[PDB]
């Protein structure tokens, strides 16, 4: 059971194909690159027939019968690709993968891709059945701390001169969308054959196609960055994510913040975080959030959140995408909020 990064994939690919390759993660670009590299090296090894099946509760399940072990009529080595759903496999998909793994042979190479499996599913019977035979590839989006380094690395891959300001602009505009970043690098290489990249046009050949998640929004709120929080909210509204998931994601952290602020007057935050099982990534963030906010601001935040919840589940109105905005400004570097606007 090997574990690897995309950068190291060639190292395993030029050594010899394993029984199967699992492409887990959430980056379309990284997963696509890994799958394409595996397919290319398999074709170099003499793999010609490719069949792609999407795992769905209603999809075809002829893949089990597709393992005829009789291709010999033409004798073209087969590669099988499976696309896991957004939430990963279910029980039925579990035994389907069990019976597919049980029929694996040398002539067939299995490529499995999808969203990263949770711990409850990482102990599934089929996944264990792939032990000592499979190479997992970790493809998780680098965060804004690590994203500029990745952008610089890919720019060096294309032999393009990337300026720091251009790197920052591309990181800001295309956060959470690596495929968009690769397309932008290709498009800017096409626009400028000279190879350099500077502000006057990288700020022109770009759009706000960033994709975010509610966790990014909650992190922005905790760090008190109003501009980033509002931009993330706008991007999430444009993407069409349901407001209820935003409400729940912010409610969990806000309730934790209220409890921690209440308990801070008697116990140091260092022990409080450990009691509440706060991860090292978020301990400092929540410490700064607590040090920035007072009880009154948290009470106003929860009042606004309650009003938003009521106006969402009772009046069915569309004003929620406005109210959340105010809640953003309610918790960032001197909110200076109001009462009638929220109360």
């Amino acid at each position: 059971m090997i574990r690897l990064y995309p950068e190291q994939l060639r190292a395993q690919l030029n050594e010899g194909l394993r029984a199967a390759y699992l492409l887990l993660g959430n980056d379309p670009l990284l997963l696509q690159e890994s799958q394409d590299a595996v397919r290319q090296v398999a074709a170099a090894q003499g793999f010609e027939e490719h069949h792609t099946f999407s795992i769905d509760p209603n999809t075809d399940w002829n893949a089990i019968f597709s393992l005829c072990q009789a291709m010999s009529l033409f004798a073209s080595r087969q590669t099988l690709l499976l696309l896991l759903p957004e939430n990963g496999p279910n029980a039925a998909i579990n035994e389907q993968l069990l019976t597919l793994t049980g029929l694996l042979h040398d002539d067939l190479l299995l490529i499995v891709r999808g969203n990263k499996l949770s711990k409850a599913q990482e102990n599934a019977a089929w996944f264990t059945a792939l032990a000592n035979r499979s190479v997992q590839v970790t493809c998780q989006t680098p965060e804004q701390a690590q994203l500029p380094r990745w952008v610089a690395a890919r720019a060096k891959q294309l032999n393009l001169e990337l300026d720091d300001a251009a790197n920052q602009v591309l990181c800001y505009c295309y956060e959470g969308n690596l495929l968009a970043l690769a397309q932008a690098l290709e498009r800017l290489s096409l626009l400028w054959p000279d190879g350099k990249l500077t502000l006057p046009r990288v700020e022109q050949a770009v759009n706000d196609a960033a994709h975010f998640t509610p966790f990014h929004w909650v992190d922005a709120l905790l760090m008190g960055k109003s501009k980033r929080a509002l931009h993330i909210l706008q991007q999430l509204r444009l993407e069409g994510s349901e407001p209820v998931i935003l409400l729940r994601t912010l409610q969990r952290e806000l309730l934790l913040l209220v409890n921690l602020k209440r308990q801070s007057a008697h116990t140091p935050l260092r022990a409080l975080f450990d009691k509440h099982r706060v991860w090292q990534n978020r301990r400092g963030m929540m410490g700064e959030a607590l040090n920035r906010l007072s009880q009154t601001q948290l009470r106003q935040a929860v009042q606004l959140l309650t009003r938003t919840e009521l106006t969402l589940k009772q009046d069915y109105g569309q004003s929620v995408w406005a109210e959340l905005e105010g809640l953003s400004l309610l918790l960032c570097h001197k909110p200076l909020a109001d009462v009638f606007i929220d109360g």
């Binding site: 019968f65 005829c68 009789a70 010999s72």
Partner: protein
């Protein structure tokens, strides 16, 4: 003015319409693609039906006075108008503005038309090779090979059927990766060796197009299309730039075992085994002895089927499993008194032929079970 003056007999018109309306189907890629092209010229009417890869043209002679012209008419509507009229009834046709007036006695219909300039026309070409075949020969070539053709495969090579011509021999090859069928027939003419691909719909149209009469069939194969002449019907279809293997290469070059069995009994036994075989996972296993050729199958319902034959054999025992549907199709295509079966290994191919005929050969690839 341009008028489609027609005075035809329903018996001279039903069959050509029944032929030209074949390739046409519902939901066309263009509205013009759903209308048959009428073209009256000289003293004959040309009926044209196209799919952007076919042109099916039927020429019908005329006797009554008529005026030249070209237009289009809906396929199903006009065909049913011709069909519904009484036997021996004349059909008169005219064009007024953009309306085709079809009259017969007192019956009158006014169908909607389209301009004839918008109808696509396949480009002119020169024929590379020319064949002359009997109807029965081409019929047997198609019916005994088309069943093994692939269906909607990602590899566009296997979607069609291969014609391989060598000297006085013409053979058809069809495969899907798991089955393969080849059939060779003799011709009275010397012909250059040539391998050509015909698409699935093309071979379907070719099979349905030929009649049961004794009229000779003419074949033309060019650089990138094929044409067939049968009486007053001409069908032209594009080809496929594809790669196919050697039939000898796929079949066991050195066969190891020989079996001779009755076709009907084996068909019945395989069908009976397929009854309890999984409807999706169609497949059985055969175990061979001097007389026992046991066929076994089972379903996820734990219902097992085992059956025994009385087949001549003198070699070693062997267990080979494969899809029941493949052998059922092979036997149904054979239509022979006795069948010979050649086995080499479980992971190797399985050949099937006619015990008194080497004209048609079939090979199936057994699946591990």
């Amino acid at each position: 003015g341009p008028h489609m003056k027609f005075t035809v007999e329903r018996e001279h018109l039903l069959k050509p319409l029944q032929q030209v309306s074949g390739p046409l189907g519902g939901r066309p890629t263009l509205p013009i693609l759903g209308n048959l092209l009428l073209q009256v010229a000289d003293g004959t009417l040309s009926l044209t039906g196209t799919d952007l890869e076919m042109e099916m043209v039927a020429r019908v002679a005329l006797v009554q006075p008529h005026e030249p012209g070209a237009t289009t008419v809906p396929a199903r509507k006009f065909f049913d108008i011709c069909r519904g009229l009484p036997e021996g009834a004349e059909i008169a046709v005219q064009l007024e503005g953009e309306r085709m007036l079809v009259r017969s006695g007192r019956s009158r219909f006014s169908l909607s038309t389209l301009p004839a300039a918008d109808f696509p026309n396949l480009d002119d070409w020169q024929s590379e090779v020319e064949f002359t075949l009997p109807q029965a020969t081409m019929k047997r070539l198609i019916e005994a090979t088309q069943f093994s053709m692939a269906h909607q495969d990602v590899r566009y090579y296997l979607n069609g059927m291969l014609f391989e011509t060598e000297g006085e021999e013409l053979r058809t090859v069809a495969t899907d990766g798991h089955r393969l069928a080849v059939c060779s027939m003799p011709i009275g003419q010397s012909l250059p060796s040539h391998s050509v691909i015909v698409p699935r719909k093309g071979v379907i149209e070719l099979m349905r197009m030929l009649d049961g009469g004794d009229n000779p069939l003419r074949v033309q194969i060019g650089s990138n299309n094929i044409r067939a002449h049968v009486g007053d019907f001409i069908f032209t279809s594009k080809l496929v730039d594809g790669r196919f293997p050697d039939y000898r290469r796929v079949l066991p070059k050195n066969p190891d075992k020989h079996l001779e069995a009755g076709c009907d009994l084996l068909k019945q036994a395989f069908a009976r085994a397929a009854i309890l075989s999984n409807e999706k996972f169609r497949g059985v296993r055969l175990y061979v002895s001097e007389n026992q050729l046991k066929i076994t199958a089972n379903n996820p319902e734990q219902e097992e089927a085992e059956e025994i034959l009385d087949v001549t054999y003198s070699g070693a025992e062997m267990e080979i499993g494969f899809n029941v549907s493949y052998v059922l199709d092979v036997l149904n295509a054979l239509k022979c008194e006795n069948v010979r079966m050649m086995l080499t290994d479980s992971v190797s191919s399985v050949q099937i032929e006619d015990a008194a005929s080497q004209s048609a050969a079939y090979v199936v690839m057994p699946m591990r079970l």
